[PDB]
Design a protein around this ligand. Structure first.
Ligand SMILES: O=C1N[C@@H](Cc2ccccc2)C(=O)Nc2ccccc21
Ligand SMILES: O=C1N[C@@H](Cc2ccccc2)C(=O)Nc2ccccc21
Ligand SMILES: O=C(O)CCC(=O)C(=O)O
Ligand SMILES: O=C(O)CCC(=O)C(=O)O
Ligand code: NI
Ligand code: NI
Lengths: 288, 288
């Protein structure tokens, strides 16, 4: 059976979205440079170590879906300079997203999270994303263009033995889920900085960690149309941090108004005909 | 032909959503008391008078759809005590919305706006709402439950001669728009405080003002599932105003996290497993 298509971030940029559109998955080799992965890991390191179990009894909004051997930390902008600057302004990410979402309009980050899987983390069940947060997506027509996509960026090696992600190629066009089986999957073997890109309809799952020693870490960036509400809030991010960002990064974090692709678009998150950024006179690219 | 069903806010509360579900429209008599209409009008009065044309060349996000004889003012919470307290906490509104949106989860205000139509304002073309802001809604399956509804509350008399709203009953279940004609419409004749309730699929239009003397005003409250992005932002509303509100009103304005109806809901606008309100220690019901 056939493997996940691999593409260069540098040379095959225009081929990336068409490939995902056709097959439901693609590996973008060197999506983030090793330098950015290095800085990213450095900055989130302590935050993943202090993170409790997904369903911790201290949480307002516990996650009952992820395994107890999973640590997920989101709202990365205040934690990570590499995230807020380098990845939020990634030229490759933005070309792919504008390729993907042009039918709808503006897009933004629905969630940027680092996930770390402890040794011997079991495989997740095969699934489509968004079903625990956006029930609306299940009511979309089967051929509706994808309203969100997920960049699963390796922050450590992805191997078959350490639980590299499984995908079923072509499953983004499936309606019937009766042939859903691990038998039908292929693996995303990746070096740090490579990214597996899937859609909200691609059937996939985290793999079983079988070494008992390796700790797999990933940066999952769910990008979605600005018409859908993010899983995470940047409302509590200090204004000096927000004002350090580019206008584009600000929009991605919900600190700007948004636009649909309707010819006479009337806009989203507007204030009596004016943008958030104008109204609040929000500054941009003000260094810390 | 048959008229829009009229229901009492007091005695037929449980019948309201089922009626809209069946017919696509209902008139809720005395939705807002005359006292609340009175205070509401008093408070927004100067803000509608200073409002420029919808497509004013000074605007970041001009509205090119509304007539030049329309004045729309939104983000009402900072302007209006009656809005922020009485209508955002309306028991009737919240019963109807929880009736309507229980399949999806939490709902919030996509837009609360006062619209005032000058004398001799022409009829709007027949339309469905949401098509200039949320192209996603057109990709929903035809039988998907409505993801937003619109309360068109009369703030002055609605008469046939002064341009009372037209609706086509049953048109929320139409797929084929070839019998779209003013011939097929009936009118929402209303006293101040009555509300016409429609869905995002109900075909309707503002009427032609024919007296040349009357000024019609309405409060349009588009309520929608929390999975869809509001047309307006409350990000720039002073924190003392937000802290004067109830927790429910805060959630409605995007100053709280939200939940979907998925059995293991992982939530919306959350911060590392915790709510906005906890994280920012947002106070509630702190009087001005
Ligand atoms: O918690 C998350 N559940 C997934 C789906 C899922 C996860 C495990 C087992 C079954 C299903 C999701 O829908 N969205 C995301 C996206 C980024 C990170 C985590 C999640
Ligand atoms: O501008 C708005 N256009 C409408 C649709 C429309 C209006 C006039 C003529 C044709 C179509 C809309 O989709 N949403 C709203 C909702 C509240 C107030 C105004 C509008
Ligand atoms: O662990 C992985 O590689 C994939 C994680 C995932 O699919 C999810 O949590 O939604
Ligand atoms: O003017 C009216 O009564 C209806 C207004 C309306 O439907 C709209 O602006 O979307
Ligand atoms: Ni997943
Ligand atoms: Ni309308």
């Amino acid at each position: 059976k056939s493997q996940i298509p691999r593409l260069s971030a540098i040379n095959d940029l225009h081929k990336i979205w068409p490939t995902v559109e056709e097959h439901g998955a693609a590996i973008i080799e060197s999506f983030l440079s090793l330098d950015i992965v290095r800085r990213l890991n450095e900055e989130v390191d302590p935050f993943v170590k202090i993170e409790p179990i997904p369903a911790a009894k201290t949480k307002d909004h516990p996650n009952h879906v992820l395994s107890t051997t999973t640590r997920l930390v989101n709202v990365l902008a205040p934690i990570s300079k590499a995230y807020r600057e380098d990845v939020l302004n990634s030229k490759v990410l933005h070309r792919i997203c504008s390729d993907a979402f042009h039918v709808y309009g503006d897009y933004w980050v629905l969630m940027g999270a680092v996930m770390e899987l402890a040794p011997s983390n079991p495989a997740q069940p095969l699934h489509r994303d968004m079903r625990f947060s956006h029930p609306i997506v299940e009511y979309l027509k089967p051929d509706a263009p994808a309203t969100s996509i997920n960049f699963l960026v390796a922050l450590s090696p992805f191997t078959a033995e350490n639980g590299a992600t499984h995908v079923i190629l072509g499953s983004h066009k499936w309606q019937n889920l009766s042939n859903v089986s691990m038998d039908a999957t292929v693996r995303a073997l990746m070096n740090p900085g490579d990214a597996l890109l899937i859609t909200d309809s691609t059937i996939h799952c985290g793999g079983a960690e079988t070494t008992g020693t390796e700790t797999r870490r990933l940066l999952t960036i769910t990008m979605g149309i600005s018409q859908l509400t993010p899983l995470e809030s940047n409302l509590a991010v200090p204004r000096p941090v927000i004002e350090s960002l580019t206008p584009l990064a600000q929009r991605l974090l919900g600190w700007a108004s948004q636009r649909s692709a309707a010819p006479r678009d009337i806009g989203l998150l507007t204030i009596r005909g004016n943008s958030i950024e104008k109204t609040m006179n929000l500054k941009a690219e003000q260094p810390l």
